[PDB]
């Protein structure tokens, strides 16, 4: 089974949850962070922290050594400006996954690489543009890669009963940050989203 994950993006909305929740299930976690000030103290910690950038080949490569899969949240912190951060640090990524003999990575775009790509909000169009390029660069790397692909992602607490479709329509168009990070984990221990688009989705009302 895998143990050791390195989780990229941890210090982001949907990452900080992912890593306290991978702890506290048992991983032996590696994150790759900028500024380790945005780590928490309280609650559950990783195992290991490298400081550095997943535009940078060597601190990928630091990262992805001795892992059994990899977890990808990047993310560009609401900067909608053209970008192509998140496509080359998974560049980057499946660079170091084949060096090292990692198979897995479970990676978050959005739900808009599964709904009608003509109904893309005009300021989403940029940073959608670079998760369709991340997309392909992991699609194409022939690891076994889940494909996560939410929508909104809201406040509202864990629940686990979210509802998983493969073709962007379910009960609501929203997911919890925590609920898609515990969806992440999941995919660490089955094959069936393997090759697969993913849509977690829930009505917390
Ligand atoms: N907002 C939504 O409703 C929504 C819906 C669907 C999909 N998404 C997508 O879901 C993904 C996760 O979103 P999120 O809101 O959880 O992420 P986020 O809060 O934007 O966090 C982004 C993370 O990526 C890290 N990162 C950015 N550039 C980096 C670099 N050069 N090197 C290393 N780490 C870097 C950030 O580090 P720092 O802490 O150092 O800044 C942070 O940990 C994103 O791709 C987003 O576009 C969002
Ligand atoms: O996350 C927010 O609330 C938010 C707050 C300020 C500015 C933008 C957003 C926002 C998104 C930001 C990024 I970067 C991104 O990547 C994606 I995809 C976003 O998808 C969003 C979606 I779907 C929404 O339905 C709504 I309402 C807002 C966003």
Redesign the pocket.
Known sequence: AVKKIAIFGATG?TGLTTLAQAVQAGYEVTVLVRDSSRLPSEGPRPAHVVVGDVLQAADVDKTVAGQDAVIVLL??????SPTTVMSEGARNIVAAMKAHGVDKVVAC????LLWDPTKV?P??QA??DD?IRMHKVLRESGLKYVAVM????GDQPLTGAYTVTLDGRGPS??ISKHDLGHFMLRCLTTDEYDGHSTYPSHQYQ
């Open positions: 909305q993310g560009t912190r609401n900067d909608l775009t959005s739900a808009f909000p300021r989403l940073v959608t998760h939410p929508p909104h992602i168009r929203v």
